Amino acid sequence: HMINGSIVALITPLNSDGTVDYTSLEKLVEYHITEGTDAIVAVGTTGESATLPISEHIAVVGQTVKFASGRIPVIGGNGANATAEAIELTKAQNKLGVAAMLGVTPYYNKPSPKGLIAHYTAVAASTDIPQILYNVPGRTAVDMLPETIAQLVEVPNIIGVKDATGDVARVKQLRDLCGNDFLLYSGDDATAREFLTLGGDGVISVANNIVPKLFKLMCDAALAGDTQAAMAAEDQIKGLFSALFCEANPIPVKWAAHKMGLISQGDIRLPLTELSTEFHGLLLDAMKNARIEVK
Amino acid sequence: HMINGSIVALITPLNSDGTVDYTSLEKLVEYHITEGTDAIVAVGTTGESATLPISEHIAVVGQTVKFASGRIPVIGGNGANATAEAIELTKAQNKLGVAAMLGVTPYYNKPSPKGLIAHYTAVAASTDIPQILYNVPGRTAVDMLPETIAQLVEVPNIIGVKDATGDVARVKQLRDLCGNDFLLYSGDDATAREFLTLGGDGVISVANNIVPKLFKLMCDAALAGDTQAAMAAEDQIKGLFSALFCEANPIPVKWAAHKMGLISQGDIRLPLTELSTEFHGLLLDAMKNARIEVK
Numbered sequence A, B: 001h002m003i004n005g006s007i008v009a010l011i012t013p014l015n016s017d018g019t020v021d022y023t024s025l026e027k028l029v030e031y032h033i034t035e036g037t038d039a040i041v042a043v044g045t046t047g048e049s050a051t052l053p054i055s056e057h058i059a060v061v062g063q064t065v066k067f068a069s070g071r072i073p074v075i076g077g078n079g080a081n082a083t084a085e086a087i088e089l090t091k092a093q094n095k096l097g098v099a100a101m102l103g104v105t106p107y108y109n110k111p112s113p114k115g116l117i118a119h120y121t122a123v124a125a126s127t128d129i130p131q132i133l134y135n136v137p138g139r140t141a142v143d144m145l146p147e148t149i150a151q152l153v154e155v156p157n158i159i160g161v162k163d164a165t166g167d168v169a170r171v172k173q174l175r176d177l178c179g180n181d182f183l184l185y186s187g188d189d190a191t192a193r194e195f196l197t198l199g200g201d202g203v204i205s206v207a208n209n210i211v212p213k214l215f216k217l218m219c220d221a222a223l224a225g226d227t228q229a230a231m232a233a234e235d236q237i238k239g240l241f242s243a244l245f246c247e248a249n250p251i252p253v254k255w256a257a258h259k260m261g262l263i264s265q266g267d268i269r270l271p272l273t274e275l276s277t278e279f280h281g282l283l284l285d286a287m288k289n290a291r292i293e294v295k
């Protein structure tokens, strides 16, 4: 495909009663279009997939598409830890208008490598939308290694992989086993720029939510081989790459977005909780240092 | 209250079409009654909670209670990584006939300590059935420590905790922070005898699916202070404590039970896969050495 560069793993904004705040979601979409983000992932981990039941999950993906109105690709979150639940989310998104789907490996139940292969083959067989694989063993408790991802490159609608391990040596291992056309996205903001420098195609990012302009600049420059401009853009925002993780994503990034006036309400669904006050100064400082206005 | 000793985290047997095999489920319950098991957990991790949707999950818990006919306590699995979803599962089990519910900590979304407290408090508020907490960081990516668990002891119907860390020093730390009335169950067969000796109340176990008589003996001896008899019973089955984890549980134990003829078929739901041929000889040996008659 040609989906690449700076991709935002969008937060799902909520109202005071915990229902989805569609007005803010629309404003987030316009914001990304204006700021130059390359694509939007709806209902990934950053979008709190776990606490959206299926009907709400697909309503969010569907409305995100509708707000985009052809101006930016939207990629639908479709991972599950039951192969059948993943097919069901896929099928429900077939008619949506989504450029692609992003599916985390099964979490918590720890499938073997052949189970991962069979899981994603079954999900790919249920659609012709492109599928992007997503490895994050720090949350799922399985590390889907390059020699497993490799056995899936042959599926014609499996087009790429979001790897969040921060292990940048995996770019070369993945390039050698998957070819030049398999799309490689960093899911780890802190190593993102290096990950592009070594050969990656793009970044599906948290920090994106709040610094989309500089992040886009960082990414373009790194893809273009202009490393000084890439490091110079990274420099400004780098503190966010730890501060947005003082408590689990998206607890911090949701706080930042509310604090900035991007979304009406800071509400987040249990078992996640609002950023605790002991980290508020830490984050506010990192936001100032990233040139984010207010307060 | 009075649930302690050897508790089996029951496998969920399936037909070769992947539907639930209630004829083998019934046979499993009778077997445990015969062999002296103290209680059954239905739809824990070992029971494939992940790949059972909510209404099958309830069907399994409810049939298990029915087969038990008041002859052995049944504990219902009610963990979820969304608080609302844990509530729904708890509410559906309220009039099933369970003695207790077992709830794993939220997995994959990594809530903070205060989020865990809020989650379990909300879940406990929706029922009058006793609630056992369940910590397994190796699967969930969140480690709920003694200090956090201590703050839930006062909740009147949260009666104890299944810790699967294999960190046996936590028995002492949990006793000191929770008191003597909080029930402490080991979730880790390899350290279960030791966990009992150091003060625990019971074991919620994988191995006792296939060696229930010996595992009970070991638990009874350990609780009664007869460490020689506990150690003699452990010695005979110890091989199973690593052999049953050669792939993620319940992959091996489900293969073992089929191989023994406890269940009609060895089917398991995607993304989980049947035990790999390469481990067959290893587990068959560990089985013979535990005195299981291969059928």
Ligand SMILES: N[C@@H](CCCC[NH3+])C(=O)O
Binding pocket: A049, A050, A051, A052, A053, A054, A057, A080, A081, B081, B082, B085
């Ligand atoms: N909370 C469950 C169900 C999610 C339903 C779709 N977003 C999970 O993380 O798998």
Ligand SMILES: N[C@@H](CCCC[NH3+])C(=O)O
Binding pocket: A080, A081, A082, A085, A108, B049, B050, B051, B052, B053, B054, B057, B080, B081
């Ligand atoms: N596969 C999802 C849904 C579970 C449905 C209830 N057993 C999860 O692991 O949470």
Ligand SMILES: N[C@@H](CCCC[NH3+])C(=O)O
Binding pocket: A050, A051, A052, A053, A054, B082, B084, B085, B088
């Ligand atoms: N996220 C929860 C919401 C509660 C159930 C809605 N009927 C679920 O996955 O089911």
Ligand code: NA
Binding pocket: A152, A153, A154, A155, A156, A157, A158, A159, A160
């Ligand atoms: Na491909």
Ligand code: NA
Binding pocket: B152, B153, B154, B155, B156, B157, B158, B159
């Ligand atoms: Na209590």
